[PDB]
Amino acid sequence: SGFRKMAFPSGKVEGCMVQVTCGTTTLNGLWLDDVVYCPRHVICTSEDMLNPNYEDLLIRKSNHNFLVQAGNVQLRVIGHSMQNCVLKLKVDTANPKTPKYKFVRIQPGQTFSVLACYNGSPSGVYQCAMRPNFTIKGSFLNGSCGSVGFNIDYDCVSFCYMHHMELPTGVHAGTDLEGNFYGPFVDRQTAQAAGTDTTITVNVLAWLYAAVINGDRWFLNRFTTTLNDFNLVAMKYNYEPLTQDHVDILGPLSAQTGIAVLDMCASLKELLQNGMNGRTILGSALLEDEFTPFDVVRQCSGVT
Amino acid sequence: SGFRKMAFPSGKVEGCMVQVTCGTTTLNGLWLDDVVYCPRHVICTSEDMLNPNYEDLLIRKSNHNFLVQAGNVQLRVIGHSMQNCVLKLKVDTANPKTPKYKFVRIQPGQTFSVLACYNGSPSGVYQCAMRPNFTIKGSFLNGSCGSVGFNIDYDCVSFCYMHHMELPTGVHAGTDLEGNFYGPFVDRQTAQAAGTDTTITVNVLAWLYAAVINGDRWFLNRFTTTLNDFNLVAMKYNYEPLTQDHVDILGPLSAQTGIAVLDMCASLKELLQNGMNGRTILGSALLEDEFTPFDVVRQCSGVT
Ligand SMILES: *CC(=O)N1CCN(S(=O)(=O)c2ccc(Cl)s2)CC1
Ligand SMILES: *CC(=O)N1CCN(S(=O)(=O)c2ccc(Cl)s2)CC1
């Protein structure tokens, strides 16, 4: 029993983190096989960052200008290329700790673990979600760029995020490992505002199921609703619309608890309209939306 | 910017987790040098657990009855001893992944990371605190016993907790790595109730400093207070008394923010008396108390 915001064990990702320096800029790289992936803004002088032309800046850079350090040992850069907003630094040594891995692009609402790094060195691990506005609410200081987000399926690390920047509002933006930003963001120091950070309804419902499984039941009520009725309430409270696809994904939690998804929708509806009245659910005073249905099943069943 | 509940990177601890089986009971062990540490209740039949005499049960156990598996490889047990509520299984092979380590006994209010394991395999990492009633609020299913809590100082893992049991109230109890329970708990299936789970005041104050550093400032007010005045309010709200020692520990956060500790005490006093009024601080609707002053300085300064 108990339900915690839980990150994947980070060891397989710790073994991939390196330091990348170009000129006076130091940040993190991800070493998989004989390629080091890092944000392309490693080539920018803070002056460059206001209106950088990355193809033009990159012309002034040679392999020997990219300093790649794995622990206290230098790696030899034998090639470099730009793919979207990341650099691929080809090195002469395959990472001997390379795990089984994939590059995936996640959808809003999907959760992942972040291994926050500085100078190629792991500092902490925490759980994030891709927000509906394609930001993440992270913990990233200068030096953390190139830190990565990931999921693990048994022994295969799916890399989904690389950290690139902080918006003036202190929320975070980055890329998949193909260098494509999530959302409309660009690696330039310019006016970039986030859209509405709506609540991930399906994740809230998952977490209410987690609460019932863990003995927190006070918010269960005598009501049901319909997707259309619920969605009117969701819209009013800046919750994501619930689709039949989300109902289908919650089916295993419905089955385990014997609470119909639309009944749990009606519980959530009353919580939105009535508030918590100073009560808590799984130690929270607000409705948690950074657990996916899959996360809840994982944690409630002890998958390794 | 941003402030997340952050665990230590788990890799150094992942390399220490093994499976221990005695009879039909499987749980986790910690392999450091040539010793495997595990909960002594691994020797109990669920029947035994109601009123176990561990010295008497242990007489019926030989080295060859303790099955220790590190990944898919069996370790040879060449000795066993009981220290308080843990078994030490001497094995013929030093763990080649043994990190620098210490065994520490923590005090209430201290935070640590837990690597939740099943069958010797890491499932997740999360951040906990030793509660003032010597429970922890964990996430532990059957099979998770022997999972450990830890802090890291650069390259040295301080092991502070091993998981042993869940109370009927779904909160958790365990031992230091010398096998001494935190608090009054015993490894027996009996009536064990937790005392008052008071709020860790010094940790709340640390987190309010974290909030100011991260731009969440709405709760700062025009007031100050005294330790004695504050403590009257703390007592009423089931907060731990604040001592001068806690004020001293908050000195670096005071200095960075220019907010006197007693002023931040007066802000906290108003939050207790007035509530949050539906507002949030660092994405929380309740006052977070599982960040130590040291955790806040670590995360706000990017230590690795
Ligand atoms: C995004 C990131 O982590 N970066 C590494 C640090 N650099 S920088 O140009 O060296 C600095 C800019 C602000 C400070 Cl403080 S250091 C930016 C990219
Ligand atoms: C505390 C722990 O993780 N343990 C391992 C599992 N055993 S057991 O006796 O095999 C079981 C008791 C309940 C279930 Cl379900 S399995 C208890 C100790």
Side-chain angles (χ1 to χ4, degrees), chain A residues 1-11 14 115 118 121-127 137-141 166 172 283 285-286 290 299-304, chain B residues 1-11 14 115 118 121-127 137-141 166 172 283 285-286 290 299-304:
Chain A
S1 202
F3 202 80
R4 273 281 182 187
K5 190 61 68 56
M6 193 178 277
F8 287 99
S10 57
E14 289 169 54
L115 183 64
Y118 300 92
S121 287
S123 71
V125 66
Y126 55 89
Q127 194 63 6
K137 292 198 189 103
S139 177
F140 295 114
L141 301 172
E166 188 166 72
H172 299 115
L286 63 66
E290 291 195 353
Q299 186 171 165
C300 288
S301 88
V303 178
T304 59
Chain B
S1 202
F3 202 80
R4 273 281 182 187
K5 190 61 68 56
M6 193 178 277
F8 287 99
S10 57
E14 289 169 54
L115 183 64
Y118 300 92
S121 287
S123 71
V125 66
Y126 55 89
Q127 194 63 6
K137 292 198 189 103
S139 177
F140 295 114
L141 301 172
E166 188 166 72
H172 299 115
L286 63 66
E290 291 195 353
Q299 186 171 165
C300 288
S301 88
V303 178
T304 59

XYZ file of all heavy atoms in Angstrom, chain A residues 1-11 14 115 118 121-127 137-141 166 172 283 285-286 290 299-304, chain B residues 1-11 14 115 118 121-127 137-141 166 172 283 285-286 290 299-304:
568
model
N 0.831 -1.184 0.000
C 0.000 0.000 0.000
C 0.881 1.254 0.000
O 2.118 1.183 0.230
C -0.985 0.003 1.177
O -2.110 0.854 0.949
N 0.218 2.379 -0.207
C 0.843 3.687 -0.384
C 1.007 3.936 -1.857
O 1.045 2.959 -2.650
N 1.069 5.203 -2.219
C 1.119 5.630 -3.627
C 1.984 6.877 -3.688
O 1.664 7.871 -3.031
C -0.289 5.824 -4.181
C -0.302 5.740 -5.680
C -0.285 4.522 -6.319
C -0.283 6.900 -6.442
C -0.245 4.447 -7.701
C -0.236 6.822 -7.824
C -0.252 5.602 -8.451
N 3.113 6.762 -4.374
C 4.156 7.811 -4.391
C 4.365 8.247 -5.832
O 4.296 7.389 -6.707
C 5.449 7.241 -3.802
C 5.520 7.380 -2.294
C 5.908 8.795 -1.925
N 6.033 8.959 -0.491
C 6.227 10.125 0.104
N 6.308 11.215 -0.641
N 6.293 10.210 1.427
N 4.687 9.518 -6.047
C 5.249 9.947 -7.345
C 6.586 9.209 -7.523
O 7.519 9.451 -6.745
C 5.412 11.462 -7.408
C 5.756 11.962 -8.797
C 4.684 11.651 -9.836
C 3.391 12.409 -9.625
N 3.604 13.870 -9.592
N 6.653 8.301 -8.482
C 7.749 7.311 -8.564
C 8.447 7.452 -9.915
O 7.756 7.386 -10.934
C 7.179 5.901 -8.443
C 8.224 4.877 -8.203
S 7.394 3.286 -8.020
C 6.947 3.409 -6.297
N 9.761 7.617 -9.897
C 10.585 7.661 -11.123
C 11.071 6.259 -11.431
O 11.129 5.397 -10.532
C 11.742 8.607 -10.976
N 11.424 6.027 -12.678
C 12.142 4.794 -13.040
C 13.496 4.819 -12.347
O 14.104 5.866 -12.119
C 12.262 4.653 -14.547
C 10.972 4.284 -15.210
C 10.192 5.246 -15.817
C 10.523 2.978 -15.194
C 8.992 4.909 -16.420
C 9.315 2.644 -15.780
C 8.550 3.605 -16.391
N 14.042 3.630 -12.019
C 15.414 3.572 -11.541
C 16.291 4.151 -12.665
O 16.021 3.859 -13.801
C 15.678 2.079 -11.285
C 14.288 1.422 -11.308
C 13.405 2.314 -12.178
N 17.224 5.008 -12.307
C 17.984 5.866 -13.253
C 19.302 5.252 -13.698
O 19.952 5.876 -14.553
C 18.217 7.227 -12.687
O 18.894 7.234 -11.442
N 19.732 4.119 -13.124
C 21.079 3.596 -13.380
C 21.394 3.469 -14.871
O 22.506 3.844 -15.268
N 22.081 6.970 -16.113
C 23.316 7.497 -15.503
C 24.517 7.050 -16.346
O 25.426 7.853 -16.551
C 23.489 6.989 -14.073
C 22.507 7.602 -13.113
C 22.495 6.916 -11.768
O 23.582 6.809 -11.187
O 21.409 6.520 -11.316
N 16.363 12.568 -15.462
C 17.650 12.523 -14.730
C 18.319 13.874 -14.925
O 18.959 14.097 -15.981
C 18.504 11.358 -15.199
C 19.828 11.196 -14.453
C 19.580 10.878 -12.979
C 20.665 10.126 -15.136
N 24.294 17.931 -14.280
C 25.198 19.097 -14.385
C 26.607 18.571 -14.644
O 27.002 17.627 -13.973
C 25.097 19.934 -13.107
C 23.692 20.421 -12.929
C 22.785 19.685 -12.183
C 23.251 21.559 -13.582
C 21.476 20.099 -12.046
C 21.935 21.975 -13.479
C 21.059 21.252 -12.683
O 19.746 21.591 -12.569
N 27.125 14.873 -14.832
C 26.983 14.148 -13.545
C 25.545 14.206 -13.058
O 24.967 15.284 -12.967
C 27.932 14.667 -12.506
O 29.234 14.222 -12.859
N 24.937 13.024 -12.845
C 23.585 12.909 -12.289
C 23.432 13.598 -10.935
O 24.226 13.354 -10.040
C 23.399 11.381 -12.237
C 24.173 10.910 -13.461
C 25.446 11.725 -13.329
N 22.440 14.476 -10.814
C 22.138 15.178 -9.548
C 20.838 14.642 -8.932
O 20.787 14.499 -7.716
C 22.115 16.666 -9.731
O 20.995 17.061 -10.473
N 19.827 14.316 -9.729
C 18.562 13.847 -9.154
C 17.679 13.236 -10.192
O 17.946 13.443 -11.390
N 16.676 12.487 -9.740
C 15.646 11.922 -10.640
C 14.261 12.295 -10.136
O 13.982 12.245 -8.915
C 15.830 10.410 -10.828
C 15.579 9.659 -9.550
C 14.946 9.866 -11.934
N 13.388 12.654 -11.065
C 12.014 13.072 -10.714
C 11.111 12.689 -11.871
O 11.597 12.467 -12.975
C 11.951 14.558 -10.386
C 12.468 15.517 -11.421
C 11.655 16.025 -12.417
C 13.756 16.014 -11.319
C 12.139 16.946 -13.334
C 14.245 16.945 -12.212
C 13.426 17.430 -13.209
O 13.960 18.348 -14.063
N 9.819 12.720 -11.606
C 8.776 12.300 -12.553
C 8.123 13.570 -13.094
O 7.942 14.521 -12.316
C 7.867 11.368 -11.753
C 6.912 10.549 -12.566
C 7.577 9.585 -13.499
O 8.794 9.383 -13.539
N 6.735 8.918 -14.234
N 6.942 20.740 -16.420
C 7.188 21.489 -15.185
C 8.327 20.735 -14.506
O 8.051 19.728 -13.806
C 5.892 21.542 -14.381
C 4.742 22.362 -14.970
C 3.695 22.682 -13.882
C 2.394 23.310 -14.359
N 1.254 22.341 -14.396
N 9.548 21.163 -14.773
C 10.768 20.434 -14.390
C 11.474 21.130 -13.259
O 10.898 22.045 -12.627
N 12.699 20.700 -12.996
C 13.634 21.383 -12.077
C 14.981 21.411 -12.767
O 15.617 20.349 -12.845
C 13.683 20.712 -10.748
O 14.643 21.362 -9.916
N 15.309 22.541 -13.401
C 16.474 22.671 -14.307
C 17.177 24.005 -14.080
O 16.516 25.048 -14.141
C 16.008 22.604 -15.754
C 15.416 21.309 -16.223
C 14.076 21.224 -16.583
C 16.193 20.168 -16.304
C 13.553 20.047 -17.087
C 15.659 18.993 -16.806
C 14.342 18.927 -17.190
N 18.448 23.957 -13.707
C 19.276 25.169 -13.513
C 20.161 25.282 -14.741
O 20.171 24.318 -15.497
C 20.107 25.031 -12.237
C 19.296 24.833 -10.961
C 20.224 24.523 -9.805
C 18.435 26.051 -10.660
N 14.182 27.168 -20.658
C 13.207 27.641 -19.656
C 12.536 28.859 -20.274
O 13.255 29.708 -20.831
C 13.911 28.018 -18.371
C 12.956 28.335 -17.237
C 13.750 28.341 -15.950
O 14.519 29.308 -15.788
O 13.712 27.310 -15.209
N 9.269 24.559 -18.739
C 10.402 24.015 -19.512
C 9.973 23.545 -20.893
O 8.841 23.080 -21.063
C 11.084 22.938 -18.656
C 11.583 23.537 -17.397
N 11.082 23.170 -16.169
C 12.494 24.510 -17.174
C 11.664 23.894 -15.233
N 12.561 24.710 -15.807
N -2.609 12.058 0.251
C -1.748 13.113 0.818
C -1.737 14.373 -0.026
O -0.864 15.218 0.185
N -3.872 17.806 -1.648
C -5.006 18.752 -1.546
C -5.458 19.196 -2.942
O -6.462 19.920 -3.067
C -4.597 19.942 -0.701
N -4.750 18.801 -3.984
C -5.263 19.065 -5.342
C -5.283 17.741 -6.106
O -4.726 16.730 -5.608
C -4.436 20.171 -6.001
C -2.965 19.888 -6.237
C -2.777 18.778 -7.266
C -2.266 21.165 -6.698
N -0.299 13.724 -12.959
C 0.967 13.242 -13.598
C 1.190 11.770 -13.201
O 2.338 11.336 -13.088
C 2.115 14.210 -13.285
C 1.965 15.564 -13.983
C 3.187 16.490 -14.053
O 4.233 16.164 -13.416
O 3.115 17.552 -14.784
N 2.538 0.731 -10.545
C 2.849 0.949 -9.110
C 1.950 0.080 -8.230
O 2.463 -0.421 -7.209
C 2.744 2.410 -8.705
C 3.209 2.623 -7.277
C 3.342 4.070 -6.876
O 3.431 4.374 -5.689
N 3.326 4.983 -7.843
N 0.691 -0.120 -8.601
C -0.273 -0.871 -7.759
C -0.023 -2.385 -7.881
O -0.440 -3.079 -6.942
C -1.704 -0.456 -8.064
S -2.046 1.200 -7.415
N 0.729 -2.848 -8.894
C 1.044 -4.271 -9.196
C 2.538 -4.624 -9.035
O 2.845 -5.808 -9.211
C 0.629 -4.598 -10.589
O 1.691 -4.307 -11.477
N 3.440 -3.654 -8.800
C 4.873 -3.874 -8.486
C 5.687 -4.394 -9.668
O 6.563 -5.271 -9.465
N 5.442 -3.877 -10.872
C 6.233 -4.285 -12.075
C 7.687 -3.825 -11.863
O 7.871 -2.738 -11.267
C 5.643 -3.708 -13.380
C 6.472 -4.086 -14.605
C 4.187 -4.107 -13.568
N 8.670 -4.606 -12.343
C 10.131 -4.298 -12.285
C 10.716 -4.200 -13.706
O 11.890 -3.809 -13.854
C 10.888 -5.345 -11.454
O 10.687 -6.636 -12.034
C 10.456 -5.374 -10.005
N 15.167 26.997 -12.776
C 13.971 27.201 -11.988
C 13.117 25.929 -11.998
O 13.357 24.989 -12.803
C 13.173 28.420 -12.472
O 12.299 28.937 -11.468
N 12.110 25.948 -11.142
C 11.236 24.810 -10.869
C 11.771 24.084 -9.667
O 12.986 24.201 -9.361
N 10.888 23.378 -8.986
C 11.214 22.694 -7.724
C 10.391 21.418 -7.680
O 9.161 21.486 -7.734
C 10.985 23.620 -6.534
C 11.772 23.175 -5.336
C 13.113 23.463 -5.225
C 11.162 22.419 -4.344
C 13.849 23.007 -4.145
C 11.902 21.958 -3.268
C 13.230 22.279 -3.152
N 11.083 20.286 -7.701
C 10.448 18.957 -7.843
C 10.821 18.123 -6.628
O 11.949 18.255 -6.165
C 10.951 18.297 -9.130
C 10.126 18.674 -10.345
C 8.844 17.872 -10.366
N 8.047 18.168 -11.540
C 6.820 17.709 -11.733
N 6.276 16.937 -10.808
N 6.130 18.052 -12.813
N 9.924 17.245 -6.189
C 10.316 16.163 -5.262
C 11.339 15.284 -6.001
O 10.979 14.650 -7.002
C 9.103 15.367 -4.791
C 9.428 14.409 -3.663
C 9.938 15.105 -2.405
C 8.893 15.948 -1.707
N 7.692 15.165 -1.356
N 12.582 15.295 -5.552
C 13.716 14.758 -6.336
C 14.408 13.665 -5.526
O 14.790 13.943 -4.387
C 14.716 15.873 -6.624
C 15.711 15.500 -7.658
S 16.775 16.931 -7.932
C 15.739 17.824 -9.078
N 14.568 12.491 -6.116
C 15.312 11.373 -5.500
C 16.759 11.450 -5.944
O 17.071 12.060 -6.985
C 14.714 10.045 -5.864
N 17.636 10.840 -5.175
C 19.021 10.633 -5.629
C 18.985 9.705 -6.835
O 18.132 8.826 -6.968
C 19.892 10.095 -4.507
C 20.219 11.123 -3.470
C 19.514 11.179 -2.286
C 21.210 12.058 -3.697
C 19.806 12.137 -1.331
C 21.490 13.028 -2.751
C 20.792 13.070 -1.571
N 19.961 9.852 -7.754
C 20.103 8.873 -8.820
C 20.357 7.519 -8.136
O 21.086 7.497 -7.179
C 21.304 9.363 -9.646
C 21.545 10.807 -9.176
C 21.000 10.891 -7.751
N 19.680 6.486 -8.593
C 19.587 5.173 -7.906
C 20.628 4.170 -8.379
O 20.663 3.077 -7.790
C 18.219 4.588 -8.031
O 17.774 4.422 -9.367
N 21.412 4.473 -9.424
C 22.292 3.469 -10.034
C 23.189 2.766 -9.013
O 23.323 1.538 -9.101
N 20.986 0.304 -7.183
C 20.537 -0.762 -8.098
C 21.602 -1.866 -8.136
O 21.234 -3.040 -8.141
C 20.321 -0.224 -9.512
C 19.112 0.663 -9.621
C 19.044 1.404 -10.934
O 19.111 0.722 -11.964
O 18.908 2.637 -10.911
N 14.600 2.996 -3.130
C 14.589 2.167 -4.358
C 13.697 0.969 -4.076
O 14.165 -0.013 -3.451
C 15.999 1.781 -4.768
C 16.088 0.976 -6.063
C 15.592 1.803 -7.248
C 17.517 0.494 -6.261
N 11.358 -5.578 -6.134
C 10.634 -6.868 -6.099
C 11.534 -7.923 -6.737
O 12.102 -7.639 -7.783
C 9.290 -6.716 -6.815
C 8.463 -5.674 -6.126
C 8.515 -4.352 -6.540
C 7.711 -5.994 -5.010
C 7.792 -3.374 -5.887
C 7.002 -5.023 -4.325
C 7.026 -3.716 -4.790
O 6.376 -2.711 -4.141
N 14.872 -6.866 -8.047
C 14.834 -6.018 -9.265
C 14.214 -4.667 -8.953
O 13.124 -4.602 -8.395
C 14.120 -6.697 -10.395
O 14.970 -7.728 -10.879
N 14.970 -3.586 -9.222
C 14.482 -2.211 -9.063
C 13.215 -1.926 -9.865
O 13.178 -2.201 -11.055
C 15.706 -1.394 -9.519
C 16.873 -2.252 -9.049
C 16.419 -3.628 -9.499
N 12.181 -1.418 -9.199
C 10.910 -1.042 -9.854
C 10.762 0.485 -9.907
O 10.288 0.988 -10.919
C 9.734 -1.710 -9.205
O 9.493 -1.172 -7.935
N 11.183 1.215 -8.881
C 11.008 2.672 -8.896
C 11.815 3.334 -7.829
O 12.278 2.627 -6.914
N 11.996 4.645 -7.961
C 12.665 5.459 -6.921
C 11.783 6.638 -6.544
O 11.174 7.296 -7.419
C 14.076 5.878 -7.352
C 14.039 6.826 -8.519
C 14.859 6.490 -6.208
N 11.720 6.920 -5.251
C 10.876 8.021 -4.740
C 11.543 8.565 -3.492
O 12.374 7.885 -2.899
C 9.448 7.557 -4.489
C 9.254 6.375 -3.579
C 9.112 6.522 -2.212
C 9.087 5.111 -4.117
C 8.887 5.423 -1.395
C 8.843 4.012 -3.320
C 8.719 4.173 -1.955
O 8.479 3.054 -1.216
N 11.087 9.732 -3.077
C 11.652 10.480 -1.944
C 10.685 10.319 -0.773
O 9.465 10.328 -1.007
C 11.843 11.903 -2.466
C 12.702 12.788 -1.615
C 14.121 12.325 -1.491
O 14.596 11.368 -2.109
N 14.839 13.076 -0.709
N 5.941 7.206 4.855
C 4.773 7.089 3.977
C 5.352 6.667 2.632
O 5.803 7.554 1.864
C 4.038 8.427 3.963
C 3.359 8.860 5.264
C 2.320 9.968 4.986
C 1.713 10.647 6.205
N 2.283 12.007 6.463
N 5.404 5.367 2.404
C 6.123 4.768 1.267
C 5.157 4.249 0.238
O 3.946 4.559 0.300
N 5.682 3.481 -0.706
C 4.883 2.705 -1.677
C 5.506 1.327 -1.753
O 6.591 1.212 -2.344
C 4.824 3.383 -3.003
O 4.101 2.571 -3.926
N 4.932 0.367 -1.023
C 5.530 -0.971 -0.803
C 4.458 -2.052 -0.886
O 3.450 -1.953 -0.177
C 6.171 -1.025 0.576
C 7.353 -0.133 0.816
C 7.283 0.918 1.723
C 8.538 -0.337 0.134
C 8.398 1.690 1.998
C 9.647 0.445 0.413
C 9.578 1.460 1.335
N 4.617 -2.985 -1.815
C 3.694 -4.131 -1.973
C 4.395 -5.329 -1.361
O 5.575 -5.181 -1.067
C 3.393 -4.355 -3.454
C 2.758 -3.167 -4.169
C 2.683 -3.442 -5.656
C 1.382 -2.853 -3.600
N 4.238 -3.013 6.942
C 3.128 -2.058 6.750
C 2.238 -2.207 7.974
O 1.955 -3.355 8.362
C 2.358 -2.390 5.491
C 1.321 -1.344 5.129
C 0.885 -1.594 3.704
O 0.171 -2.598 3.521
O 1.392 -0.885 2.781
N 4.371 2.870 6.880
C 5.466 1.887 6.787
C 6.426 1.994 7.961
O 6.636 3.091 8.490
C 6.127 2.045 5.409
C 5.133 1.784 4.342
N 4.737 2.765 3.463
C 4.417 0.678 4.043
C 3.812 2.277 2.660
N 3.608 0.986 2.965
N 3.044 24.415 -6.979
C 2.082 23.428 -7.506
C 1.425 22.611 -6.411
O 0.813 21.587 -6.724
N -1.201 22.439 -2.939
C -2.315 23.033 -2.167
C -2.127 22.769 -0.668
O -2.914 23.273 0.153
C -3.631 22.463 -2.660
N -1.127 21.995 -0.290
C -0.820 21.871 1.147
C 0.662 22.194 1.343
O 1.409 22.313 0.339
C -1.244 20.490 1.650
C -0.547 19.288 1.044
C 0.930 19.258 1.425
C -1.241 18.008 1.503
N 8.515 17.420 3.207
C 9.526 16.342 2.962
C 10.632 16.903 2.048
O 11.214 16.153 1.262
C 8.826 15.066 2.475
C 7.981 14.394 3.560
C 7.519 12.948 3.334
O 7.734 12.411 2.207
O 6.955 12.322 4.313
N 19.007 21.283 -4.387
C 18.208 21.400 -5.631
C 18.309 22.815 -6.202
O 18.364 22.927 -7.443
C 16.754 21.007 -5.431
C 15.997 20.993 -6.745
C 14.612 20.403 -6.660
O 13.807 20.590 -7.569
N 14.301 19.715 -5.566
N 18.362 23.842 -5.362
C 18.366 25.250 -5.830
C 19.764 25.635 -6.349
O 19.802 26.588 -7.141
C 17.826 26.184 -4.760
S 16.035 25.990 -4.580
N 20.817 24.861 -6.038
C 22.239 25.095 -6.411
C 22.811 24.033 -7.375
O 23.968 24.214 -7.768
C 23.086 25.126 -5.186
O 23.516 23.813 -4.877
N 22.089 22.939 -7.680
C 22.461 21.924 -8.695
C 23.658 21.066 -8.295
O 24.507 20.761 -9.168
N 23.741 20.660 -7.028
C 24.849 19.768 -6.562
C 24.699 18.414 -7.282
O 23.537 17.997 -7.497
C 24.849 19.594 -5.029
C 25.950 18.651 -4.554
C 24.935 20.932 -4.308
N 25.820 17.754 -7.619
C 25.874 16.408 -8.267
C 26.611 15.405 -7.359
O 26.626 14.200 -7.674
C 26.538 16.482 -9.650
O 27.861 17.005 -9.506
C 25.766 17.336 -10.631
